[PDB]
Curated annotation (Swiss-Prot), chains A, C, D, E, F, G, H, I, J:
GO biological process: viral life cycle
Family: Belongs to the lambda phage gpW family.
Chain's role: Plays a role in morphogenesis of the virion head after genome packaging. Presumably interacts with the portal vertex to stabilize the packaged DNA within the head after packaging. Probably binds to the head-tail connector protein FII.
Taxonomic classification: Viruses, Duplodnaviria, Heunggongvirae, Uroviricota, Caudoviricetes
Subcellular location: Virion
Annotated Gene3D superfamilies: Head-to-tail joining protein W (3.30.1580.10)
Entry keyword Kinase: no
Protein name: Head completion protein
Any one GO cellular component localisation term in the record: virion component
Curated annotation (Swiss-Prot), chain B:
Role, per record: Forms the portal vertex of the capsid. This portal plays critical roles in head assembly, genome packaging, neck/tail attachment, and genome ejection. The portal protein multimerizes as a single ring-shaped homododecamer arranged around a central channel. Binds to the terminase subunits to form the packaging machine.
Subunit (UniProt): Homododecamer. Interacts with the terminase complex composed of two small and one large terminase subunits.
Native organism: Escherichia phage lambda
Entry's family note: Belongs to the siphoviridae portal protein family.
Protein name in UniProt: Portal protein B
Residues of the full protein shown: 25 to 54 of 533
Post-translational changes noted in the entry: Proteolytically cleaved by the viral protease during capsid maturation.
Location relative to the cell: Virion
Length: 67, 30, 67, 67, 67, 67, 67, 67, 67, 67
């Protein structure tokens, strides 16, 4: 249960980024809201889980120099 | 003059008990 | 209870990251709110309990240097 | 009775930082809210309470060196 | 009579730190608010009162050194 | 009046420390509040008043150093 | 009138310190509030009033040294 | 009008210090408020208007030194 | 037409210092709020207007030195 | 049209400095409000518009020195 976690996190990130992350909803006697999370830490979390799971290669090992 | 009290009181409470050399040494000789 | 503590903390962190940590709920005269903890603090908590528990190696000890 | 209150406190910390620290509770004409506290203070309180109570070993005298 | 005040203060510390200090109670038409002190000054008061009362030893005199 | 005034001030300090410094009080239609002071100012007021009054001291000379 | 002004200042400071300065009063149709002065400002004012009035010595001059 | 202006200003200053710098006056249907001023600025204004006024000695010229 | 401006500004400063610079006015349906100024800028305006107007000698320049 | 708005701005500055720049006005559901400015920007605007228009000299060009 990791790939669907990654997909849900990416979808939520996109929704928050554009316009879609609903903060609060009000109906007649129904006030329900969810605390928002910063995009920076959301990106850190999604990157961490992506590199933790069996996903492909994204990071590289430093960089050597040669004349 | 200088031995009276000192500059602005200063040594106003320092007064050695003028005494003999023996009277200064013997009490705490050992 | 450490295992279900692990599971609950992981699920709570995931839902808070995505969309699902409710601050308050209101029902026409029945509203209750909950204190919100920092994302960093939640990360520290989950890491601390995970390393305390019997889960396998997550971090090793320093790193040597060889020529 | 240190153990009882220590266990209650740690369970409260877990519940609060997961999802369930009731800040305020409302009825029709009944409002009751409790004071809120940070997490670092209660964490260090738990640490000091555990160390002052006769629990298992948790801290060790510095760390020496040798060639 | 320092012991009873110390007991009250430590109980207040416990309940405030966990969940059980009400900042204010609002019965319908009958409401009252109490000033919320911090945990820092509260434990300062705890320390000063427990050291001024004739309870057990809590702290000693510096620390020597020897080869 | 100094002695009972000091006793009342100490009692008020204890009440504020625990739970009893009433910030505001309201009944149907009638509402008042009392401006709340800090803790350090109150305790230093207590200290200076206890010093200036004639009861037993708690302050001594600076120090003395002898080999 | 300096002496009674000083007495009023002393009583006001005592009330402020303990519990007894009203920030506002309300009578469901009539309500009035007052600005809250700083405790340090009140102390400075009462101290300068004490010095200026015909009160006896409170503060001496700078302390000289003697050997 | 310097004398009565000074007297009114000083009385207002004393009232503000003690208990009665009314910030707002509210009767049902009619609510007004006056602006709130600092204390140090009021004190220095009092001092400068005094020294402008032909009142008694209040200041001196630097200070002299002699062995 | 500057002397009457000076008089009006001085009166405004006096009443603002004492008690009488109204911020809001409410009559059960009609409300007027006036912008809040400060004291520093007000006395700067007083000084600039008094020096520009036909006000008499109030300010002198540098200083001489002699033995 | 320069002197007209010069005088208008000067009068507005005098009003704001004195007491009655209307921040907002409301009467039975007819509420409007006007944005506020700062005295510094208003004065510099006055100065620059005065320079732009044909008002007499107010500022000059440095000042030479001579023994």
């Amino acid at each position: 249960t990791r790939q669907e976690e990654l997909a849900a996190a990416r979808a939520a990130l996109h929704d928050l980024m554009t316009g879609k992350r609903v903060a609060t909803v009000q109906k007649d006697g129904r006030r329900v809201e969810f605390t928002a999370t910063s995009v920076s830490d959301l990106k850190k979390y999604i990157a961490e889980l992506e590199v933790q799971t069996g996903m492909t290669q994204r990071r590289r090992g430093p960089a050597g120099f040669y004349v | 003059h200088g031995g009276g009290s000192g500059f602005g009181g200063q040594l106003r409470s320092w007064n050695p008990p003028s005494e003999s050399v023996d009277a200064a040494l013997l009490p705490n000789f050992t």
